[PDB]
Amino acid sequence: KPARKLKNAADEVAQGNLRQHPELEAGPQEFLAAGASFNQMVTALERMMTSQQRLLSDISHELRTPLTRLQLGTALLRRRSGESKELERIETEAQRLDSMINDLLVMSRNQQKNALVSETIKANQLWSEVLDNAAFEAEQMGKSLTVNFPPGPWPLYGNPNALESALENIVRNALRYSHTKIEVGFAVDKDGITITVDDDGPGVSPEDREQIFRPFYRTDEARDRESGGTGLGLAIVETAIQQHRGWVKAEDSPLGGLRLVIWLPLYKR
Amino acid sequence: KPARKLKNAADEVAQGNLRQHPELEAGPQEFLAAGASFNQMVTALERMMTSQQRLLSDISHELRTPLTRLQLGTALLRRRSGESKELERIETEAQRLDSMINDLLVMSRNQQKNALVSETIKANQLWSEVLDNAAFEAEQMGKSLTVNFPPGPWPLYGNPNALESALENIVRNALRYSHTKIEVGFAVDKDGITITVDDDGPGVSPEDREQIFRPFYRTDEARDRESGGTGLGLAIVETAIQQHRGWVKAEDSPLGGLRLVIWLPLYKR
Ligand SMILES: Nc1ncnc2c1ncn2[C@@H]1O[C@H](COP(=O)(O)OP(=O)(O)OP(=O)(O)O)[C@@H](O)[C@H]1O
Ligand SMILES: Nc1ncnc2c1ncn2[C@@H]1O[C@H](COP(=O)(O)OP(=O)(O)OP(=O)(O)O)[C@@H](O)[C@H]1O
């Protein structure tokens, strides 16, 4: 049917397959024009799409040119001097950045959803690497990172990097805006993992506790010692967890600062 | 008539009008499904369009954290071992990458706010405010701003702030790098508005005329004249216009400097 040709084409492009439909330009009916205009429209949308897509994948390669020189450099230090414990942390951060750039590349070219690359993963595997790197950062800023309860072989379903980043942020946010201590508490039950990250520093006014989770938004109070302050962090967190069927809340910490709590459901086979 | 609803909707979205068409969900005909699937498709295409923007703001944000751990690491190598010739290269690459990310974060902060509202707008309404403020800036730096032809009630469809900013930059770049005069020329035809911005100042070598539009690229010649910062300006411009179904080119100005030409299609309906 000519009505069915359009149903099928509109539902196909909606998936993300902006390929031409010659099917809609068949039959000299009143529909030839609705099909030729739809065919024009896919190339029009493709034209608009491959614009953000290219001058993304462009940003990608110019970020790669100084990383490659950094990676080239570290590798030459290793050959001259030894295998310093710090060379390893510089090395692995370059490796960590190299993947995030190839993520800026593959995810631009995809231009679709469901690309969530969701797998089965254990809580202990997921955030161990996170916590270790967080613990290191504390020593460097002379603050105390105490993890009251560690994560265990607790099952989860979703994007590892997405969840990794959710906590990575919560803890760094806690690390930054604290005074001297950060406490991370894992909790597990028949329904889900409950991460609670407490800080030493100043809290956030009860009214602003909801606002923080707004993208590109920072509290007026923290806006007077800003520096490396964007306002992105917690809005990313909120999404990652909410799309992982869980929730995130901001409370008043008994440590005197702010409490962030992430709840995530367990993966049940 | 149900065939005409689709002609009109497909030709409207093709122009960037990703707004919902309730018209296609009228009449309990065989077309209700082709219209409901088309309506689903616009929100699907809008979701894709916005995602590519969110992706960058997120990837740039998360790229900042392993750098910090790099930068933390290098700084600790310096304290343990010496000031290795290679450590300097690793150090300066991290510096360049961080500066890039810092302003890559600034760009996507604006782009999200610029790409907030999509709508029908007249060329005269859009860039008048821009040009007036540009004209004022010229008097203040003792330069001449002459607008050979003003914009008229010419129809356009897209983000006002996105397009506003595209020209705002082209003219300011023209203003900065000029010696004494800046000429802006509007032109309109049955197909589109053609803005041409000419500068008195030094031009750009024919080989570098393509390079300029690269993110972070700032010509070696005009890297000594101004302390600057990014090089994103023209790379942002290129995207804004390219995603607004138009193009941007850099030619040799008859004013002796550089001329930039922005072509944008008219909104028809
Ligand atoms: N642990 C914390 N203690 C106190 N205030 C906090 C804490 N975490 C977040 N905030 C407040 O929430 C605001 C917004 O947080 P958000 O994650 O959205 O952005 P950001 O941390 O400021 O910046 P970035 O995007 O670089 O992470 C901060 O500016 C700060 O005022
Ligand atoms: N009108 C112009 N005349 C001469 N050179 C120009 C002109 N506009 C741009 N350029 C050159 O192209 C480079 C890149 O353009 P771009 O718009 O990114 O400017 P920018 O100053 O580097 O960055 P931004 O405008 O964001 O501050 C400039 O650094 C300069 O060398």
Residue numbers in the entry:
A (entry chain B), B (entry chain A): 188 to 456
From the article:
The polypeptide chains of the HAMP domain were fully traced into SAD-phased experimental electron density maps of the CpxAHDC orthorhombic and trigonal crystal forms. The domains are formed by two parallel helices (α1 and N-terminal part of α2) linked by a long connector, which despite a low sequence identity adopt a dimeric four-helix bundle similar to the Af1503 and VicK HAMP structures. In all homodimers, the fixed CA domain is sequestered by the DHp domain in an inactive kinase conformation, with the ATP-γP positioned far away from the phosphorylatable His248. Instead, the active site formed by the second, mobile CA domain is poised for catalysis in three independent structures crystallized in two distinct crystal forms (trigonal and hexagonal space groups), with the ATP γ-P and the acceptor His248 Nε atom well positioned for the phosphotransfer reaction to proceed. The catalytic cores (DHp + CA domains) are very similar to each other in the three independent crystal structures; they can be superimposed with r.m.s.d. of 0.9–1.4 Å and display an identical network of hydrogen bonding interactions involving key functional residues for ATP binding and catalysis. This highly conserved active site geometry in distinct crystalline environments emphasizes the stability of the CA–DHp interface in the Michaelis complex and lends further support to its functional relevance. In the Michaelis complex, the CA carrying the ATP molecule and the phosphorylatable His belong to different subunits of the homodimer, which structurally confirms trans-autophosphorylation for CpxA. The geometry of the active site points to Glu249, the amino acid adjacent to the phosphoacceptor His248 in the DHp domain, as a key functional residue. Its carboxylic side chain makes hydrogen-bonding interactions with both the Nδ atom of His248 and the carboxamide group of Asn356 from the CA domain.
